[PDB]
Short mmCIF file of C-alpha atoms (C1' of nucleotides) in Angstrom, two decimals:
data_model
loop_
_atom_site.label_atom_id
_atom_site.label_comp_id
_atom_site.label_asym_id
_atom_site.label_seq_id
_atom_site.Cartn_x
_atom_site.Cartn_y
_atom_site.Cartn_z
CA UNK A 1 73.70 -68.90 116.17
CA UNK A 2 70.92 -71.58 114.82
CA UNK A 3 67.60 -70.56 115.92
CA UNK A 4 64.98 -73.23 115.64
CA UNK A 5 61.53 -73.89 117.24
CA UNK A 6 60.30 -76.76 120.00
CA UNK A 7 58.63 -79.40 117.34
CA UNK A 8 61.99 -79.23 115.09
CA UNK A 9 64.39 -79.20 118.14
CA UNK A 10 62.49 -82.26 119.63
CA UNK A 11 62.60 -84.03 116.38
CA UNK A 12 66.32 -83.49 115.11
CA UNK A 13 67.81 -83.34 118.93
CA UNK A 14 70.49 -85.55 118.01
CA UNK A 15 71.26 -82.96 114.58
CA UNK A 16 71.57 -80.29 117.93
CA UNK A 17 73.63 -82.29 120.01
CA UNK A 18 75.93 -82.67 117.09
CA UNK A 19 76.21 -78.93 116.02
CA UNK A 20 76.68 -78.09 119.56
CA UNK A 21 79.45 -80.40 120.26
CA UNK A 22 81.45 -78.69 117.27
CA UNK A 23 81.00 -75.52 118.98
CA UNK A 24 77.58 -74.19 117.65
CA UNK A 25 75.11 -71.85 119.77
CA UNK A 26 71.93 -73.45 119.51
CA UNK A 27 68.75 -71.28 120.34
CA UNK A 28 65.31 -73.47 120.87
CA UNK A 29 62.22 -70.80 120.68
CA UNK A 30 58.42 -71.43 121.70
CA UNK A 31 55.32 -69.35 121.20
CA UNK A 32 55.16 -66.57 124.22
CA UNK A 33 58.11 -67.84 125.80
CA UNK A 34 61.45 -66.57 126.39
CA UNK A 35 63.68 -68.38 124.75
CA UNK A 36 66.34 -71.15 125.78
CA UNK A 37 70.81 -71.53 124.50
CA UNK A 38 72.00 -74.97 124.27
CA UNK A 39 75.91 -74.59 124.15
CA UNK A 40 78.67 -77.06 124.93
CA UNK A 41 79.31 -77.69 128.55
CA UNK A 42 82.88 -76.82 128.47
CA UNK A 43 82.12 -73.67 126.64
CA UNK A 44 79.36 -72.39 129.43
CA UNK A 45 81.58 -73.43 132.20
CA UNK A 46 84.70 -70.99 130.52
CA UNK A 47 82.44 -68.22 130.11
CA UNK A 48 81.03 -68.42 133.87
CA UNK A 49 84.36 -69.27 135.17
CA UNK A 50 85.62 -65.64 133.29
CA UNK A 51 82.35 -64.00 134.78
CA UNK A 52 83.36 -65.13 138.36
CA UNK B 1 73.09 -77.72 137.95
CA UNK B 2 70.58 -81.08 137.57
CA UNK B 3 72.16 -83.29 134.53
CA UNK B 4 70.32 -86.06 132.07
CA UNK B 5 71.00 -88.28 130.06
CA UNK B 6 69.26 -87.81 125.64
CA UNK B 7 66.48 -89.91 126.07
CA UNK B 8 65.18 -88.31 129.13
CA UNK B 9 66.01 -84.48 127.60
CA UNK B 10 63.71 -85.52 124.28
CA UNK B 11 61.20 -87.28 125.70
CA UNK B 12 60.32 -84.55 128.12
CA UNK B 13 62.30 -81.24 126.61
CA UNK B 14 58.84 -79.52 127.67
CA UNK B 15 59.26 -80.16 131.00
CA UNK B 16 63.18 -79.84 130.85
CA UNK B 17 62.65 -76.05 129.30
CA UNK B 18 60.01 -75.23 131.59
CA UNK B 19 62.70 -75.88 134.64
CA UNK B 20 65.13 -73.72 132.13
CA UNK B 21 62.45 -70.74 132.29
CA UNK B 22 62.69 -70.90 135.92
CA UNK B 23 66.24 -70.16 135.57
CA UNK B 24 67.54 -73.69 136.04
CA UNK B 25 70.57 -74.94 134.18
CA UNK B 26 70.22 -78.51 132.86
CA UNK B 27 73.34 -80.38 131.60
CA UNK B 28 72.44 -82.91 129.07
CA UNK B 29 74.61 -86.30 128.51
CA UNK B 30 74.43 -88.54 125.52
CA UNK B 31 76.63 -91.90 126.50
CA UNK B 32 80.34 -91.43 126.05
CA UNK B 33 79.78 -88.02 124.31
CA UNK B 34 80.64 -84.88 125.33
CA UNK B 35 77.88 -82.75 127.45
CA UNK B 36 75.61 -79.73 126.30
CA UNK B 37 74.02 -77.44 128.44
CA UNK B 38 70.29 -75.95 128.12
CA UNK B 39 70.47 -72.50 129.64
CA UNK B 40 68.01 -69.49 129.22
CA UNK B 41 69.24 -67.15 126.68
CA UNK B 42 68.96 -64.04 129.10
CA UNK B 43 71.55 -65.70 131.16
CA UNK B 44 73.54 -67.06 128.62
CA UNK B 45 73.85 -63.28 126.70
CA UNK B 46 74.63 -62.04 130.51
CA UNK B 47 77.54 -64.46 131.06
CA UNK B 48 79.06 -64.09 127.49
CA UNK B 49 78.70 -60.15 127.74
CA UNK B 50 80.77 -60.42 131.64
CA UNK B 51 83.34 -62.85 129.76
CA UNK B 52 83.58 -60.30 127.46
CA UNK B 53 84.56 -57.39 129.83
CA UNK B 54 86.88 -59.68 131.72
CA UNK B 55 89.38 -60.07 128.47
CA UNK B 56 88.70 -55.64 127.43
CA UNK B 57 91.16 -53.30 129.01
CA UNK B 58 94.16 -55.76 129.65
CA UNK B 59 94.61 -56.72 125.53
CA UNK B 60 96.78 -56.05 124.43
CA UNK B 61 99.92 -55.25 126.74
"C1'" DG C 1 68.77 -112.10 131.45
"C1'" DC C 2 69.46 -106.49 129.19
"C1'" DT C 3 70.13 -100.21 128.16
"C1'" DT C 4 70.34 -95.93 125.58
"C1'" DG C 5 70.18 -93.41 121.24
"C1'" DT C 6 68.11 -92.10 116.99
"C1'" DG C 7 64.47 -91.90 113.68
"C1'" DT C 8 60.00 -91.75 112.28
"C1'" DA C 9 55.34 -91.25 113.53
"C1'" DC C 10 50.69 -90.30 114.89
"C1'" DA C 11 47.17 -87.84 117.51
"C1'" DC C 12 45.21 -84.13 120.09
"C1'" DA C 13 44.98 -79.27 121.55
"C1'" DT C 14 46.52 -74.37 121.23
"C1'" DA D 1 51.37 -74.69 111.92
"C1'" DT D 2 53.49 -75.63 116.32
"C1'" DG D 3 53.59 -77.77 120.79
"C1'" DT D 4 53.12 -81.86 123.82
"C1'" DG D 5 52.27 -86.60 124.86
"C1'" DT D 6 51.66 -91.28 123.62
"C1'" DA D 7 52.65 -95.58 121.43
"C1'" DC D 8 56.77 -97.15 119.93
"C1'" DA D 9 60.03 -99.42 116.87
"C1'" DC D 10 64.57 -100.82 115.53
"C1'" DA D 11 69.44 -100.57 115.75
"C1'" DA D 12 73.77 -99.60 117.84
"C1'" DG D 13 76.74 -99.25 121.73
#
DNA sequence: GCTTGTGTACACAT
DNA sequence: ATGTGTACACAAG
């Protein structure tokens, strides 16, 4: 799991999109905030479909 | 679950992670590709760790 | 008589 | 040194 901050996020989204399509678990961190998982729709809705 | 397209996710990813903070899921669309979704990592970890305990006992026969 | 994505980029303010 | 907003461009679909 990639681990990256806002500013590089914002600027290489599309580089995020891409790794995340092929599966990747992308984290996005920001100073003092809890941070954020950008995954692959069809992976999230498996895993919360197996939760439920 | 409230859903956007790239260019609205970049140009205001602040404002999109702020929503994700409050514990909003946001499904992100670029044109003709296949979606993402920004989820907070919290509930992520909780939903992977419950998928996890689903598939446990029952392996292997 | 257009629309979205992607890439650089600057310019505060924290 | 990183976030956040603002102009964009320009190019590609």
């Amino acid at each position: 799991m990639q681990s990256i901050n806002f500013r590089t996020a914002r600027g290489n989204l599309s580089e995020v999109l891409n790794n995340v399509e092929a599966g990747e678990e992308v984290e996005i961190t920001r100073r003092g905030r809890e941070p954020a998982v950008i995954v692959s729709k069809a992976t999230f809705e498996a895993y919360k479909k197996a939760a439920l």
